[PDB]
Structure formats: structure tokens, C-alpha cells
Ligand binder design. Structure first.
Ligand SMILES: [Mg+2]
Length: 519
């Protein structure tokens, strides 16, 4: 009876997975079967239907390998994920607990992906990029909790690819086909690169890929481009998260981790930053039951229970919500005369990306930034003065603001959350979207100074102003959790002072934020 053994169910998404694991970290059993969608016409089916048909076939096999009387705990994926899939998973898990007369534990699918990462790889405290069909977020364990530092703002990357494959009439799963076509591509088609803070968005990209297809661009080139852009965007936010959580290893996780290109771009990045890079073996990388079981053990082994009424599925289970109980883009230089001071900001090259992309990202952000830092004094917003610019070398000569970063003084002086709101309000009052609102991008002296503008854009759309505010919101929630409530409240106070339409877009935030799981 030494090794306590647990049976876990995975069913958050499109994969039916059953796992048996022992508290000693031994995987006695682990098989998963995927949903194969029927024609999207009439006579519809859903993954839930697949789970209902598949779970008991898998459980039979499991009981043929180990004695059901030997299993001591049953665990299941409580969320996040598809509601109808969660419910079949839960109902099957509950039936097992009741007839085996054994305890049951609901487990967070996301932090289960990473825990078997640690168990199954030489990682121990990684910044982990989790990508799949329904999920894409950057997670790290900080301050006693698993937290999101970067996530998609709309669809997951897996879904971006899946929809594109469908559009261009590739069979399911189309991922492998896009990855092969991309290898034969050579032109880097014009597509939108969309990073905002540490988050990203794939919708515009997907659409532009579609329009490029309609315009008669070579399928191979579109595929190559789709991948380069999406994967670069994902490598960038992981890079930013890395410099932000101060971790020394990165772990890639999820079905999309199967993509070699993504794996290699991600390894280059980690090699550049001298950090370790781990990927679990295929069978623990994509959705699987073993990870559910192992995390199940972790929490129960450390003493935590669940009444059948506590086993309600949580479609939007956030990583924050889980009680844990088992544990740079720009070189800046300062030049001085005996009284005058200048700083030069160089956007250095990123080896991991296609040099063509790298050239456009560095030049355009540099040009934008220069142009925007200038334009914004017209609105009464302190910023550095722009002395000169050298776009060939990706450099800016600007004035020097002596002071601490907002990120470093905001919690012990919440007033400066107000000033940030004032200058954002002034921004949106004037149609400028600053797509990187964080507390690392303002410097506080007497007034408050804005010091980044590389992702700027002119726009009168409310969706864009709304997203602007969510990126700020989300960033505050991850890096200033101890004081989040208050900083946002005062951020809105400042915003309200200046921009009279604040209410319209604040409400618009909600409808955009509901790019979550149904129910
Ligand atoms: Mg998963």
C-alpha cells in the first residue's frame, strides 16, 4: 500500500484521456483518444458526445492493467475548458468515486500540464508557455500562486491554425499540413504582428492570412508567414515574461508544442537569454490523464478534500484561483557631458526570428516610438524629448529622465496610478492607442513620464481603447497583485478626469473580456 495510486480523467477539450499514477511519480497507465469532428453541417456532434463514448472504453483498458481496488484516489480536470466536455468528465469521475467509494479531487488542467512537466523533465521552477487549441498563456509560480503573465486576448494559437487549415481546405488536424507547407515557403507575406504588453491576439492575423489566400498568395508562403508571425509573437511575450518573473528556465507545453518550428524558435530565444528549455515527452505534452492524476495526488497527498458538491466544473478556472499546497528588447545607454545628459535606446536584434521580420519589427517600433514620444507633448503628457534618430541602426537619442520606474514606486505611493490614468485618458481622447500600458513604461520624478511607445497606433475605434485598458488591467493583476484593486480603481479615477467617453469603453471592456469559455 506504500505508493498511493490515483486515476485521473482529462476531458477539458477535444481529447479523452485516462491516467493512472502513483504518489511515487510512477505512471502505470496513460492513454488518450481524440475527437474526430463530423461535417459542420446538420446532424451535429460535440466533443462531449465523443467523451461519453470514449471514457468507458479507456477505463476498461485501465482496469485491465491495474486492479481497480488498488486505486485510492480519483481525479478529473475541473477546468478550464468546454462546459459540455467538463460535465461528461465530471459525471464519469463522480460515478467512479461513488462506486469505488474513494475520494475525488477536481484539478486545474492548466497547472496540471506544468506539474507533469516538472515531474517528467529536468525543469523545477520554469516560466512555461502553454499552447493548445483552446489555451495559450504564459504561466509561472510566483508569490505562492501559479499566475498568468501573458495570455491570448481572443482565440488560442491552436485555434488560429485550425481555422486557417479549414479555410484553405486542409483535413483535420491541419496543423501538420501547415507545418509542412511552411517549410517549402520563402516569401514573408505582409501580416499583422500583434503583441500588446505581455498578451497577444491572433484574430487579425488569422483574417489577414485568409485575405492573403483570397488574393492569390502562394499557400506555402502564407503558411510559412502564419507560423513565423504567430510563433515570434509567442516567443516575444515569453521573452518579456522571462525578463519579468526572473526565472532561469522555460518549459513549452501543450499540443502545439508538437510543432518543430515553434520548438526551435523557442530554443534559440532561450539560448540567447542563457536559460534552460524543456519540453515534456509527447504523451505528457498534449492533453492527457496522467497529469490530472499526478496533480490530484499532489493536492490530496498534501491533505485536501472535495465534497461531491465541490466538484462542480469551472469552465473559466483561472490559475490564481488554485491554492498551492505542494511546493529585454532594448539596450539603453547614458551619455554625459559635464551637465547635459542624453540616452540612446537601441532595439537589438532577436536571433530567434526570421531576419526579415526582425528588421521590420525593430525599424518600425523605433520609428513609431520616436514619432509618438514627440507627438504626445501636444496633449500635455511628459515624455523624453527626442533629439535624433538613426533608423538604420534602430537607435534613438532622447532626453534623460532621472527617477524610479512606476513598477518600483507605485505600491508605496498609489497616487501615481492616477497620473497613469490621466495620460491614458489624454491618449484616447486624442485617438492614440498605446498598446503596451504597464508600470515598467512610466518613470516617476515630480510628474509622471511615459517612456515607451513602440507599439502605438492611431485609432478611433472603441474596441481598441477597450483592449488598451484590459492590457493595463491584466498587467497590473499579474505584477501588482498585492495592491491590484486599488491601483485600478485610481487608474479609472484619472482616466475619468480627462476622457468623457470613459463609460462607453469601460462597458465595452466587458463584452470584449467575454472572449472566454461559454458558461
Ligand atoms: Mg491541455
Amino acid at each position: 500500500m506504500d505508493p498511493m495510486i490515483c486515476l485521473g480523467l482529462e476531458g477539458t477539450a477535444e481529447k479523452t484521456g485516462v491516467g493512472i499514477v502513483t504518489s511515487d511519480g510512477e505512471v502505470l497507465f496513460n492513454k488518450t483518444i481524440m475527437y474526430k469532428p463530423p461535417k459542420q453541417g446538420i446532424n451535429p456532434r460535440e466533443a462531449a458526445d465523443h467523451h461519453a463514448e470514449t471514457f468507458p472504453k479507456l477505463i476498461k483498458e485501465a482496469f485491465e492493467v491495474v486492479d481497480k481496488n488498488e486505486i485510492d484516489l480519483i481525479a478529473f480536470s475541473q477546468g478550464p475548458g468546454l462546459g459540455p466536455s467538463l460535465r461528461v468528465t465530471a459525471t464519469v469521475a463522480r460515478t467512479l468515486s461513488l462506486t469505488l467509494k474513494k475520494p475525488i479531487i477536481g484539478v486545474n488542467h492548466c497547472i496540471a500540464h506544468i506539474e507533469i512537466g516538472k515531474l517528467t523533465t529536468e525543469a523545477e521552477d520554469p516560466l512555461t508557455l502553454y499552447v493548445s487549441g483552446g489555451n495559450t498563456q504564459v504561466i509561472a509560480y510566483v508569490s505562492k500562486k501559479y499566475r498568468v503573465f501573458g495570455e491570448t486576448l481572443d482565440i488560442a494559437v491552436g485555434n488560429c491554425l485550425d481555422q486557417f487549415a479549414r479555410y484553405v481546405n486542409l483535413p483535420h488536424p491541419g496543423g501538420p499540413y501547415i507545418e509542412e507547407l511552411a517549410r517549402k515557403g520563402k516569401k514573408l507575406v505582409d501580416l499583422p504582428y500583434t503583441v500588446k504588453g505581455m498578451d497577444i491576439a491572433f484574430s487579425g492575423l488569422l483574417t489577414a492570412a485568409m485575405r492573403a489566400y483570397d488574393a492569390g498568395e502562394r499557400l506555402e508562403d502564407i503558411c510559412y508567414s502564419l507560423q513565423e508571425y504567430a510563433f515570434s509573437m509567442l516567443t516575444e511575450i515569453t521573452e518579456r515574461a522571462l525578463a519579468h518573473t526572473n526565472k532561469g528556465e522555460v518549459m513549452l507545453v501543450g499540443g502545439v508544442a508538437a510543432n518543430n518550428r515553434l520548438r526551435e524558435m523557442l530554443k534559440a530565444m532561450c539560448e540567447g537569454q542563457n536559460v534552460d528549455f524543456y519540453v515534456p515527452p509527447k504523451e505528457f505534452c498534449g492533453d492527457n490523464g496522467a497529469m490530472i492524476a499526478w496533480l490530484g495526488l499532489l493536492m490530496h497527498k498534501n491533505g485536501r478534500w472535495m465534497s461531491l458538491d465541490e466538484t462542480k466544473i469551472i469552465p473559466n478556472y483561472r490559475t490564481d484561483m488554485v491554492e498551492v499546497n505542494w511546493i529585454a528588447e532594448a539596450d539603453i545607454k547614458r551619455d554625459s557631458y559635464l551637465d547635459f545628459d542624453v540616452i540612446i535606446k537601441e532595439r537589438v536584434k532577436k536571433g530567434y526570428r526570421d531576419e526579415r521580420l526582425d528588421e521590420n519589427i525593430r525599424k518600425s517600433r523605433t520609428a513609431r516610438e520616436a514619432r509618438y514620444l514627440a507627438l504626445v507633448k501636444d496633449f500635455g503628457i511628459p515624455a523624453p524629448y527626442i533629439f535624433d534618430v538613426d533608423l538604420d541602426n534602430k537607435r534613438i537619442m532622447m532626453s534623460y529622465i532621472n527617477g524610479k520606474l512606476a513598477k518600483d514606486v507605485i505600491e508605496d505611493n498609489l497616487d501615481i496610478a492616477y497620473k497613469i490614468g490621466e495620460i491614458v485618458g489624454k491618449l484616447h481622447k486624442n485617438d492614440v492607442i498605446h498598446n503596451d500600458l504597464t508600470t515598467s513604461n512610466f518613470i516617476f520624478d515630480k510628474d509622471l513620464y511615459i517612456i515607451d511607445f513602440g507599439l502605438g497606433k492611431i485609432s478611433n475605434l472603441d474596441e481598441d481603447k477597450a483592449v488598451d485598458l484590459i492590457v493595463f488591467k491584466k498587467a497590473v493583476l499579474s505584477t501588482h497583485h498585492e495592491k491590484f484593486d486599488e491601483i485600478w480603481e485610481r487608474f479609472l479615477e484619472g482616466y475619468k478626469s480627462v476622457y468623457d467617453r470613459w463609460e462607453i469603453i469601460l462597458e465595452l471592456m466587458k463584452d470584449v473580456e467575454r472572449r472566454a469559455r461559454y458558461v
